[PDB]
Amino acid sequence: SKPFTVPILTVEEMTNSRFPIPLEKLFTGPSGAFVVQPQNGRCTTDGVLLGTTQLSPVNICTFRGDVTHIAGSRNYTMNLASLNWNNYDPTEEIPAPLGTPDFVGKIQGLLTQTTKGDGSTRGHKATVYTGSAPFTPKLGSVQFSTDTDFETHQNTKFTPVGVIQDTTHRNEPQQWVLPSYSGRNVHNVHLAPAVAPTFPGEQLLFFRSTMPGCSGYPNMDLDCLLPQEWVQHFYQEAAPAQSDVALLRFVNPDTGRVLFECKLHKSGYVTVAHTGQHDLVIPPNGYFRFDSWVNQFYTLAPM
Amino acid sequence: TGSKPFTVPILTVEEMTNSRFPIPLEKLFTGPSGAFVVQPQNGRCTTDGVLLGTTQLSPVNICTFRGDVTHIAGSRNYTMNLASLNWNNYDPTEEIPAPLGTPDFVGKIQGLLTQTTKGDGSTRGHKATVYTGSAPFTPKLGSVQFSTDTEXDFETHQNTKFTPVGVIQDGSTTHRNEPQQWVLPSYSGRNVHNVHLAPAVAPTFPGEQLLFFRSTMPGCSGYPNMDLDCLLPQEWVQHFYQEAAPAQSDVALLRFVNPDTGRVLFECKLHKSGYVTVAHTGQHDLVIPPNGYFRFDSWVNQFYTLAPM
Ligand SMILES: CO[C@@H]1O[C@@H](C)[C@@H](O)[C@@H](O)[C@@H]1O
Ligand SMILES: CO[C@@H]1O[C@@H](C)[C@@H](O)[C@@H](O)[C@@H]1O
Ligand SMILES: [Mg+2]
Ligand SMILES: [Mg+2]
């Protein structure tokens, strides 16, 4: 069987799988009390994509389609196309279009458009409210608010940049609250499962970034379960799993020594032996290395 | 056994990222260089994993800037004192052309400037443009200038980020006159030469042309030329950097394959210094299936004649 491996890039060389920004650090904390169920950055170790996960680091939280103006405001409805401008199929057995935001919050960026006939172009600051009633990406449409021009039947793109807040500080975004992908009073479908440590003394290990803030006092923490480069790697390699748990070691090349070890579960998430909230202190050139497949009762050395 | 076998990723063109701007690839393109010299500085990496020019590993940090800013109380423009991509101090004596990820073409790049005040976590963001052909574009010296749409609110001594979105055109009656993707900026200003560049590339074998990985940059105003060609997908850069497989000649023979059927559509040469050539004549958007991908066959000699494509 093809040997399993993980990418050897450092944390700072890899990308968050839930927003198009670099990873910055590793974090662990208790989460047994709440539900961890992100839909981007979900992939098994043998390469099966889950949830709304797709392969491009720059298409996360983007939208493409045509727009129509909502009379008496600066708001536009976008009729969604696929990530490569084909028709969007709402019957596919996924929660929402691939790359759809998987948290409730106000995402700010630029809405841009090109007119086919003459190549004229235009761009305006815009915000999408993923908690709002018109946020119905599974049905094929979302709404943007703008600050200011957009034509009908012309290709239009939202490029995300960051998040806003607008009361009590850091109350939004809520990175662990899923949007309602079909809107009010419709339950979500085909979700990737919630994850949690199943072994005593363990916690999830998160790959953490800080989202840019564009207004107010947002909570800018964003944790993903797998780097986007790991998703890309497992998808291509499709190496068979020889157990439910891949043991990884995090290595400091300056000394050759292992800093900590962790479990990469076959269904696509990492746990460590730690109790409490902890920002890991790592060497910037450290990397992860697969060492062996282990059984269900393997006890990690304390992180 | 022997040398580690060389490979390229199996991702399709449409699943990969442009190495010169943070957008997906769309198609393949070939043409003669014409009046321009092809010397891009992002997306430059040897097949055994040596990064060149301003190339770095993150697909989303391409054409970004980070640092602190200063206004003038008589203009909407801000000067940014540059830091490196992980907020480390940027040293102008480092042997690189400019901070890694700096734009490598002359044009007007629009995006958002954003900032967080460390003390209380207050944040702000405004549309901003950087003209990489302008005299204040001096990233090798550690500063660039941005024009913003509103008179002021950005604070001094606070971390500030530019996220690129697309390109604009203005100040011309001729459409699509800018950006000029093969004209390098003057990273220290026009009366100083650029340094430590990744070299220019060109087909060296009779009847061959460069093969490019092409995207269309978003346009944000005016009538810009939105074509953007790179020599290697960003995912190929990441792959070679990790694998560091030795090159066993100057040229790797690759085949481009349709996955739906497995059949070979054309063959090409991946030169060990990090660019691709094909046997073709003319300036053309290639007709390929969207899901096509490349596979390494063998290291070939310098006098190998490719089958025409
Ligand atoms: C509401 O205004 C926006 O948010 C505030 C908290 C400030 O950070 C201000 O500079 C910014 O423009
Ligand atoms: C100058 O104005 C900008 O460029 C023009 C060519 C138009 O596309 C217009 O919609 C856009 O706002
Ligand atoms: Mg340990
Ligand atoms: Mg051929």
Residue numbers in the entry:
A (entry chain B): 224 to 371, 374 to 391, 394 to 530
B (entry chain A): 222 to 530
What does the paper say about this structure?
Binding of human norovirus to histo blood group antigens (HBGAs), a critical step preceding host-cell entry, has been the focus of a substantial number of biophysical studies involving nuclear magnetic resonance (NMR) experiments, native mass spectrometry (MS), surface plasmon resonance, or crystallography as this has been reviewed recently. The highly conserved HBGA-binding sites are located in the P2 subdomain of the P-domain of the norovirus capsid protein VP116–18. Here, we present an almost complete backbone assignment of the P-dimers and uncover spontaneous deamidation of asparagine 373, influencing HBGA binding. In the assignment process we discovered that N373, located in a loop directly adjoining the HBGA-binding site, transforms into an iso-aspartate, isoD373, within 1–2 days at body temperature.
The deamidated form of Saga P-dimers was then subjected to crystal structure analysis in the presence of methyl α-l-fucopyranoside. Well-diffracting apo crystals were obtained belonging to the space group P21, different from C21 as observed previously for the native form of Saga P-dimers. Upon incubation of deamidated P-dimer apo crystals with 600 mM methyl α-l-fucopyranoside we obtained a co-crystal structure at 1.52 Å resolution, in which the isoD373 isopeptide bond is clearly visible in one of the two protein chains that comprise the asymmetric unit (i.e. in one half of the P-dimer). We also observed binding of methyl α-l-fucopyranoside to the two canonical HBGA-binding sites in the Saga P-dimer. In the chain with unambiguous density for the isopeptide bond the side chain of D374 is rotated such that one oxygen of the γ-carboxy group forms a single hydrogen bond to OH-4 of methyl α-l-fucopyranoside (left). In this chain, no unambiguous density is observed for residue 373 and the preceding amino acids, and so the density does not allow us to determine whether this chain contains an N373 or an isoD373 residue. In our crystal structure of the deamidated P-dimer complexed with methyl α-l-fucopyranoside two binding geometries can be observed at the same time, i.e. one in each crystallographically distinct half of the P-dimer. Fucose binds to the modified binding pocket in much the same place and orientation as observed for the native protein, but the hydrogen bonding to the side chain carboxy group of D374 appears altered as shown in Fig. 7 and Supplementary Fig. 23. The altered D374 side-chain orientation and the loss of one hydrogen bond can be explained by altered conformational dynamics of the loop. Except for the loop carrying the isopeptide bond, the overall structure of the P-dimers is very similar to the structures published before.
